[PDB]
Design an enzyme around this catalytic site. Sequence first.
Site, short mmCIF file in Angstrom:
data_model
loop_
_atom_site.label_atom_id
_atom_site.label_comp_id
_atom_site.label_asym_id
_atom_site.label_seq_id
_atom_site.Cartn_x
_atom_site.Cartn_y
_atom_site.Cartn_z
N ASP A 1 0.84 -1.20 0.00
CA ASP A 1 0.00 0.00 0.00
C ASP A 1 0.89 1.27 0.00
OD1 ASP A 1 -1.66 2.23 1.35
OD2 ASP A 1 -3.17 0.64 1.51
N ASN B 1 1.30 8.69 2.50
CA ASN B 1 2.57 8.29 3.13
C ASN B 1 3.79 9.06 2.62
OD1 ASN B 1 1.77 5.02 1.81
ND2 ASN B 1 0.55 6.02 3.42
N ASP C 1 4.36 5.96 7.89
CA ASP C 1 3.18 5.10 8.11
C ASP C 1 3.33 3.75 7.44
OD1 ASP C 1 0.56 3.97 8.22
OD2 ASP C 1 -0.44 5.74 7.32
N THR D 1 -5.59 -0.36 -0.18
CA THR D 1 -6.65 0.51 -0.69
C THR D 1 -7.19 -0.03 -2.02
OG1 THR D 1 -4.95 1.97 -1.56
CG2 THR D 1 -5.92 2.59 0.57
C1 LIG Z 1 0.76 13.90 9.93
O1 LIG Z 1 2.12 13.50 10.11
C2 LIG Z 1 2.39 12.16 10.12
C3 LIG Z 1 1.41 11.19 10.01
C4 LIG Z 1 1.76 9.85 10.02
C5 LIG Z 1 0.70 8.80 9.93
O2 LIG Z 1 0.98 7.60 9.95
N1 LIG Z 1 -0.56 9.25 9.83
C6 LIG Z 1 -1.71 8.35 9.69
C7 LIG Z 1 -2.90 9.14 9.15
O3 LIG Z 1 -2.54 10.13 8.17
C8 LIG Z 1 -2.05 7.64 10.98
C9 LIG Z 1 -2.25 6.26 11.01
C10 LIG Z 1 -2.56 5.61 12.20
C11 LIG Z 1 -2.68 6.33 13.37
C12 LIG Z 1 -2.50 7.70 13.35
C13 LIG Z 1 -2.19 8.35 12.17
C14 LIG Z 1 3.10 9.49 10.13
C15 LIG Z 1 4.08 10.45 10.25
C16 LIG Z 1 3.75 11.81 10.25
C17 LIG Z 1 4.83 12.82 10.41
C18 LIG Z 1 4.80 14.20 10.17
N2 LIG Z 1 5.98 14.75 10.44
N3 LIG Z 1 6.77 13.73 10.84
C19 LIG Z 1 6.12 12.57 10.83
#
Ligand SMILES: COc1cc(C(=O)N[C@H](CO)c2ccccc2)ccc1-c1cn[nH]c1
Lengths: 388, 388
Positions: free
Chosen positions: B190, B195, B208, B229
Amino acid sequence: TRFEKMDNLLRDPKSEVNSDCLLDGLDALVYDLDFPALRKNKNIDNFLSRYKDTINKIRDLRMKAEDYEVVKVIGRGAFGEVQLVRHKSTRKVYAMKLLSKFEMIKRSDSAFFWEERDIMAFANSPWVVQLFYAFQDDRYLYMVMEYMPGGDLVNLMSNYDVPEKWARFYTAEVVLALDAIHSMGFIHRDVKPDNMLLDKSGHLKLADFGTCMKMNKEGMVRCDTAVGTPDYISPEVLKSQGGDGYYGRECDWWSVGVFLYEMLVGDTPFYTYSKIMNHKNSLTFPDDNDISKEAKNLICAFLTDREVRLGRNGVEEIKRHLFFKNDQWAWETLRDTVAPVVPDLSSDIDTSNFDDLEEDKGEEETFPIPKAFVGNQLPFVGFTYYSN
Amino acid sequence: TRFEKMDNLLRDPKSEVNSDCLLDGLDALVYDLDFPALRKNKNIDNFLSRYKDTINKIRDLRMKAEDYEVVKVIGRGAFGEVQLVRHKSTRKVYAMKLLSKFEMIKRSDSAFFWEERDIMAFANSPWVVQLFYAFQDDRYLYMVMEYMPGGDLVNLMSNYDVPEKWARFYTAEVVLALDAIHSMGFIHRDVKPDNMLLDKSGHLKLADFGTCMKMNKEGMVRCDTAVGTPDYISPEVLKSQGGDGYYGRECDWWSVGVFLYEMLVGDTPFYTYSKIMNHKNSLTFPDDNDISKEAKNLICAFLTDREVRLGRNGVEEIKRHLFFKNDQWAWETLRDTVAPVVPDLSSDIDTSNFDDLEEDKGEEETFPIPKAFVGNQLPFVGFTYYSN
Ligand SMILES: COc1cc(C(=O)N[C@H](CO)c2ccccc2)ccc1-c1cn[nH]c1
Ligand SMILES: COc1cc(C(=O)N[C@H](CO)c2ccccc2)ccc1-c1cn[nH]c1
C-alpha cells in the site's frame, strides 16, 4: 540526563532490576503462562508465541542445573539440600544448595532466602561463605557457594575432646565472623555450630542465613515473633516475642556464650522452654570442672540480661577480654595462624568431614497445572545473581 | 563463554530482550496485576509489594508522555493520531504518533505497528521518516519521529497544477525511498501520496508503515488476504487474495504507476472494485492531454500484469527509463538538488502545510478493571526503543 541514572540500576549487581533480574521476570511469565487452559486468552498466546523461541534460546545460554555434575549430597533438610558439585565446563568444584519451590510455596513463606542470598553474595569477608552464582529453574532456587571441606563445628565437637586452646580460637573466629554480619546491618537471630564451617586450612566461615533481618536506623530488628532454636534464644527476644518488642545486636552475642559453654561443658546451659528467663539462678558449671576462670568469666559476660550483657558497647569490649589473651595469635592476624584442626584431605571431592546422607533417591513433588493464573514463579523474580 | 553471547542480546537495539524491552515486561506485570480483585492471590501481592516502589521510580526516569508539550494535532485516524510536540527538556520539536491501546485491543489485531516501529527505527535512510524513541504508558503506544514540515503529497497535488518537471522529481524520490524499504526486506502492500511527506527543504520521505511484511528467502510475502486501498491494488495480489497466493516486490511498483498517473491526470486510473483485472482494456488517458509520451510510457510500464511489469528485473530497470532523463539532477545527487516546492516556514512549530484538525477535545475511553488476569499490556512488551 535521567538515562545516566537509570543505567546504574541496570548494571548494579545489588539492584533487583538489573538485567539478570529483569530477565527472570520475563522467564517467569513464560513458566507461568504456557498452559493449555491459559493459552485460550488472546493476549497470553500472542505474547507466548512472540517470546517462547527467545526465552528458550536464553534458557540455554543462562546458568542451569545441567551445567554441574552432582557428586554427593553433603547436607539436607528445611525445604532443600546441599550437594557437592563440579562445573562441567571449568572443572571447579563447589557446594550447591538446591531449594524446593514447591515446598517453599505449599508451606507458605517464600522470602527467607533473600538475606541468605544478599549476605553470601555481598559480604566480601573471609568470615562468610561466598555465593558465586544464584540461579533458578521452574522447580528450584540454586545457590552455588565455595565448598567448605573441613566440615561443620557440630561434628568437630563430637569427634574431639576440645581443649581450651581450641575454644579460644573458634570463639575468636566466631566473634570476627559474627561482627562482619553486624557490619552488614544484619542480625542472625540464631547462631549455631551447624552454621560454622571450616575452609581447606581449618578456618571458620559462617553459612545458612535464613534466620536474618536488616536492623532499623535505631539499631534494632523490631519483631514480635519467636524465630530461633529453643536453646540459643535470648531472654530479651523471648519475653517480648508476642507482646510488644524490638530485638537487637545483644541477643546475637548471647549465642556465642552458648557456643563457648557447649564447647567446654559438653552440653547446653539451659535445657519446657524456660530456665533462660531465670538465666542468673539456673547458670551452673559442672563442679568440679577443669574450665578456667576466664572461660567461665566470658561465658557469664555473654549469658546475662540484655541491659548489662557484653557486646552492647561494641565489638572491642569482647576482643579485649582476658580469655582471648594468648601468645600464639592476634585479632588482626588470627586468620593467618595455623588452625587447631587442619583437614588432611585426599581429593578435591573428599567429603570425609561430612555425614553420609545418601544420594537423594526419591520422587520430585511438583506444583499442579492451573486453570487460572497462579504466578507461582512470581516471588522468585530477581533471585538470579552472577558474579560476572 | 555463553555470557559473552547473552551480552549481545542485552545490548543490541534490534533485540526484543534488550534491557529496555526487558524493563517493559516487568512494567507490564505491574500494570496488569495491581487490581484489588487480583491482589487476593498471595504470589501476586508479594511480587507487587516487592516491586511497586522500584517500577514507579523507573516510570519517572523512563520516557513518558509528560516529557513533551503538545502543540497541535497534525494528523489523525485509524486507532491513533499524530501531534506536533516539543521536548520540555532539550526544546527540540518532533512529530509524535499516539496510538490507542484500548481500541487496538477491542477491535482485535495488535501487531501491525511492529514493522512501522522497525522500519522507522532501523531504516537509516534519508528516504524514510526517522523514529527516535518509541515508548508507552498504560493507555498508548508512542512514536517520536522527525517532523516533516513540508506536509504530504495529497495536499501538494491539491494545491498546485503539477507540471511534468515536478512529477519527474517526486516519482524519482518515491522510487529511491521505496527501494530503501525493499532493501530492508519489506513490501509496503500500500504506497500512497498520504505516506509521502516532505522535509524542511521540500524533499520526500516515506512514513506510516502499518501495511508492511517481511519477505521470505524466495522473495515473496506469501499472503491470502486483501490488505490495501481499492485503487492502489495490483491484479497479482487481488486474484489470489483468498484462493492460494504469494504476493511480491512487483505489486509495490504498481502503486508508483498509480501515483505518477494521478499526478498528471488528476484522477485515479481505475474507479465495485474491478477494471484493475482488465488493466489492459480499461487503461486510458484523457484525449487529448498534454502528457508526454515518456510519462505515458512509464505509466504503462508499471500498470501492467506482474509477469512483464517494470521492476521485476530490479531497480535499475526503472532508474534507466527515459522519463527520468533530465539535465537538472542525477540519481546519485537527487536529494542534493533544489526541490520543486520548498516550504517557506515561519517558526519551528509552523503547521501551515497540514490540515487543521482541532486539538482533540474528547473522552479518553479505557479498558475495564478485571476480576481474572487479562494481560492487556502483554502484546506491547518490547515496544520501547531509545536511540541512546
Ligand atoms: C501527519 O504527520 C504524520 C502522520 C503519520 C501517519 O501515519 N498518519 C496516519 C494518518 O494520516 C495515521 C495512522 C494511524 C494512526 C495515526 C495516524 C506518520 C508520520 C507523520 C509525520 C509528520 N511529520 N513527521 C512525521
Ligand atoms: C553442608 O554444607 C552446607 C550447608 C549449608 C546449609 O545451609 N545447610 C542447611 C542444613 O544443614 C540447609 C538449610 C536449608 C536447606 C538446605 C540445607 C550451607 C552451606 C554449606 C556449605 C558447605 N560447603 N560450602 C557451603
